[PDB]
Design an enzyme around this catalytic site. Structure first.
Site, PDB file in Angstrom:
ATOM      1  N   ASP A 120     -11.600  49.544  13.108  1.00  0.00           N
ATOM      2  CA  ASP A 120     -12.096  49.164  14.427  1.00  0.00           C
ATOM      3  C   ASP A 120     -11.436  50.098  15.422  1.00  0.00           C
ATOM      4  OD1 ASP A 120     -12.641  48.095  16.943  1.00  0.00           O
ATOM      5  OD2 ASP A 120     -12.453  46.027  16.251  1.00  0.00           O
ATOM      6  N   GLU A 180      -8.298  31.197  13.862  1.00  0.00           N
ATOM      7  CA  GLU A 180      -7.075  31.538  13.122  1.00  0.00           C
ATOM      8  C   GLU A 180      -5.818  30.934  13.743  1.00  0.00           C
ATOM      9  OE1 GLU A 180      -6.452  35.300  11.165  1.00  0.00           O
ATOM     10  OE2 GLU A 180      -8.361  36.037  11.959  1.00  0.00           O
ATOM     11  N   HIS A 196     -14.905  44.639  16.198  1.00  0.00           N
ATOM     12  CA  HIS A 196     -15.184  43.789  15.052  1.00  0.00           C
ATOM     13  C   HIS A 196     -15.254  42.323  15.444  1.00  0.00           C
ATOM     14  CE1 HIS A 196     -10.897  42.709  15.000  1.00  0.00           C
ATOM     15  NE2 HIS A 196     -11.272  41.692  14.245  1.00  0.00           N
ATOM     16  N   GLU A 231      -1.137  41.913  17.354  1.00  0.00           N
ATOM     17  CA  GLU A 231      -2.588  41.747  17.415  1.00  0.00           C
ATOM     18  C   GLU A 231      -2.910  40.442  16.692  1.00  0.00           C
ATOM     19  OE1 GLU A 231      -5.822  40.972  17.012  1.00  0.00           O
ATOM     20  OE2 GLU A 231      -6.225  42.490  15.466  1.00  0.00           O
TER      21      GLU A 231
HETATM   22  N1  LIG Z   1      -5.635  39.227  14.683  1.00  0.00           N
HETATM   23  C1  LIG Z   1      -5.792  38.366  13.698  1.00  0.00           C
HETATM   24  N2  LIG Z   1      -6.813  37.530  13.718  1.00  0.00           N
HETATM   25  N3  LIG Z   1      -4.920  38.324  12.702  1.00  0.00           N
HETATM   26  C2  LIG Z   1      -3.781  39.224  12.592  1.00  0.00           C
HETATM   27  C3  LIG Z   1      -2.993  39.032  11.316  1.00  0.00           C
HETATM   28  C4  LIG Z   1      -2.001  40.178  11.134  1.00  0.00           C
HETATM   29  C5  LIG Z   1      -0.914  39.898  10.120  1.00  0.00           C
HETATM   30  O1  LIG Z   1      -0.107  38.808  10.604  1.00  0.00           O
HETATM   31  C6  LIG Z   1       0.397  38.131   9.478  1.00  0.00           C
HETATM   32  N4  LIG Z   1       0.889  36.826   9.911  1.00  0.00           N
HETATM   33  C7  LIG Z   1       0.148  35.782  10.396  1.00  0.00           C
HETATM   34  N5  LIG Z   1       0.863  34.756  10.790  1.00  0.00           N
HETATM   35  C8  LIG Z   1       2.167  35.149  10.538  1.00  0.00           C
HETATM   36  C9  LIG Z   1       3.407  34.521  10.762  1.00  0.00           C
HETATM   37  N6  LIG Z   1       3.532  33.289  11.262  1.00  0.00           N
HETATM   38  N7  LIG Z   1       4.528  35.205  10.445  1.00  0.00           N
HETATM   39  C10 LIG Z   1       4.404  36.432   9.926  1.00  0.00           C
HETATM   40  N8  LIG Z   1       3.290  37.120   9.655  1.00  0.00           N
HETATM   41  C11 LIG Z   1       2.201  36.422   9.993  1.00  0.00           C
HETATM   42  C12 LIG Z   1      -0.770  38.105   8.497  1.00  0.00           C
HETATM   43  O2  LIG Z   1      -0.314  37.969   7.158  1.00  0.00           O
HETATM   44  C13 LIG Z   1      -1.382  39.498   8.713  1.00  0.00           C
HETATM   45  O3  LIG Z   1      -0.899  40.430   7.756  1.00  0.00           O
END
Ligand SMILES: NC(=[NH2+])NCCC[C@H]1O[C@@H](n2cnc3c(N)ncnc32)[C@H](O)[C@@H]1O
Ligand SMILES: NC(=[NH2+])NCCC[C@H]1O[C@@H](n2cnc3c(N)ncnc32)[C@H](O)[C@@H]1O
Lengths: 325, 336
Positions: free
Chosen positions: A20, A121, A269, A112
């Site tokens: 993206d 999410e 996206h 992000e």
């Molecule tokens: N923009 C989104 N819609 N989602 C972004 C997710 C980005 C990354 O954050 C990680 N992630 C999500 N929550 C957590 C958390 N509480 N702690 C650490 N990593 C996390 C997840 O595994 C992924 O690799």
């Protein structure tokens, strides 16, 4: 939580996010344009994934980046950091940010965290938990705020799908125009949020900002549980069938750089979150549309986005529709 | 999901407009049936037809337009009520009769002269609708009756998938645009994108084809005993020689169906080959665990078997056995 983290152990989602270009260039520039505020400072990358944003922070002059990642992809991030020669000052720490132990509070957070409809999410709550626990007073948040927008729409792609059945006669010599009511019920009569990309010519009135989220604000996490949103009012550009409303967001970095998912701006996206009425409603120039939109966690699943819609078109009675992702 | 749950999903899918929009919008498919039916006017004029799984009824109407005296349009999902409206709209309800329910329990007044059906799924047999067509053939088709289409043929070719190559090479190309070296992720990407055992449905082009396609099975719908071949496994063996040097990623499987009538030596064919115009069926891709380098005239042989999944008869399973050059024979077991 574990189910969620495992969605990010596969390469495809990370490839999609980096591919993206609007998203990734905007984060890159939002970080690099903050070089003065990052020079010699420390950063926590919340949900660091492959580590690419943490490396941008190093290029901006950060003296140290703590890259925290709860899924198995942290192992790939460690190798990326090593490959780029940054293991002296970018440290990948596995596990949830809620339980990770940093050596120190940090000057800045980068993340992000945005999902479809902004809050699908529900990753913001992890960013806010890190803010409370690890960000120094008045620290830098990258991005620092999100803004939510709504506009009524006449979706040209939906029109084409509803009109499809009246074109079968010209394509194959069989009349199927009677299918249009059935198609309308199928494509509009449901209560799901439809994630789809619109163009500027789908927008039926000036977009309205209906909520703003300030990521520094203590107590924001509680607001998310109760719902975020607000009232809106607009007047239509001209005559068309109203199909419902589009909701989108933008985030603003500390002129400040804005990453937008508006249909009037380059595609991302995230696309937009479409809220269809049960059937089209004719509107005209200067038709007033008012209403209210609330973004809520689903009762069965806090990470699943729900949107309550209340709306009034012209003189018609107020109506409501309750959507879920 | 349980059988009850699988049946409900199937009913919900075909009771909804989207799948029927997709099928009718597939111009290669729908034109092939229109022409294939109309080309059989001499066999259909004044005769009776059973349309197995009639959907919105468009194929049954094609049969009326070809001169059929009576068409029974049997449709199990709620779309039968839409088909009834379509037939009435076209002035055809006095000889195209939409009948709700499974063809396995419908009652017709007599055996029919012909059966028409668009029953093919991804990889030909995903969704397993053929069994319903064969049940209808045994129960309702007159001796020596007509089947439209009359046969299906399965093809395989080794592939070097340009899209997969792009996805595998994506990480090595990040740095030239964003300044971050991510080349080290290529092995991880390969495991994720190729190490799985899922059949991948994707559109290929002739550029991806690494050797002359090979026909490896043929299904003659009139054959009694075809239903027993479906449970035991449909397929066959193949051999080919590579056009040139490239990374072998695996194999593409596709099908065609053939309509009777017309030129006995050149029948009308509906193909889903990557060398022919695109369809909604695309092709079924079987990726090896990692790319294998091959050269011009590298010999590739093996065997491909299409089976219903043991947990779910509607779910296609493919057993692949293959040998590349002097490498030892290998096997991989895919499911849709
Ligand atoms: N923009 C989104 N819609 N989602 C972004 C997710 C980005 C990354 O954050 C990680 N992630 C999500 N929550 C957590 C958390 N509480 N702690 C650490 N990593 C996390 C997840 O595994 C992924 O690799
Ligand atoms: N080409 C495919 N991959 N699938 C074609 C399905 C076409 C139609 O057949 C209907 N259908 C499926 N099985 C049956 C059956 N046994 N009897 C009647 N209608 C059926 C189904 O509801 C759908 O509307």
């Amino acid at each position: 939580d574990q189910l969620y983290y495992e969605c990010y152990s596969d390469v495809s989602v990370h490839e999609e996010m980096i591919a993206d270009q609007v998203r990734t260039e905007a984060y890159r520039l939002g970080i690099l344009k903050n070089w003065a505020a990052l020079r010699g400072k420390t950063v926590l990358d919340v949900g660091a994934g492959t580590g690419i944003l943490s490396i941008f922070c190093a290029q901006a002059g950060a003296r140290r980046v703590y890259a925290v990642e709860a899924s198995a992809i942290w192992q790939q991030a460690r190798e990326v950091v090593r490959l780029n020669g940054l293991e002296d000052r970018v440290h990948v720490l596995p596990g949830p940010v809620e339980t990770v132990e940093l050596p120190e509070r940090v000057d800045a957070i980068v993340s992000e965290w945005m999902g479809y409809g902004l809050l699908h999410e529900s990753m913001l709550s992890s960013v806010l938990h890190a803010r409370t626990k690890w960000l120094k007073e008045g620290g830098l948040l990258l991005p620092a705020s999100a803004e939510l927008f709504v506009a009524p729409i006449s979706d040209q792609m939906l029109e084409w799908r509803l009109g499809f059945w009246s074109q079968v006669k010209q394509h194959y010599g069989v009349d199927m125009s009677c299918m249009e009511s059935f198609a309308t019920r199928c494509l509009m009569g449901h209560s799901e949020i439809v994630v789809q990309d619109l163009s500027g010519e789908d927008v039926l009135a000036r977009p309205q900002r209906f909520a703003q989220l300030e990521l520094a604000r203590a107590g924001l996490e509680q607001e998310l549980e109760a719902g975020v949103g607000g009232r809106f009012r607009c007047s239509c550009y001209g005559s068309a069938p109203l199909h419902g409303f589009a909701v989108w967001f933008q985030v603003t970095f500390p002129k400040p750089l804005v990453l937008s998912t508006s249909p009037l701006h380059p595609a991302t996206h995230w696309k937009q979150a479409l809220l269809y009425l049960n059937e089209p409603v004719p509107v005209e120039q200067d038709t007033d549309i008012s209403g209210e939109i609330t973004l809520l966690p689903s009762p069965d699943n806090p990470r699943r986005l729900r949107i309550l819609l209340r709306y009034k078109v012209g003189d018609h009675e107020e109506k409501t529709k309750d959507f879920a992702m």
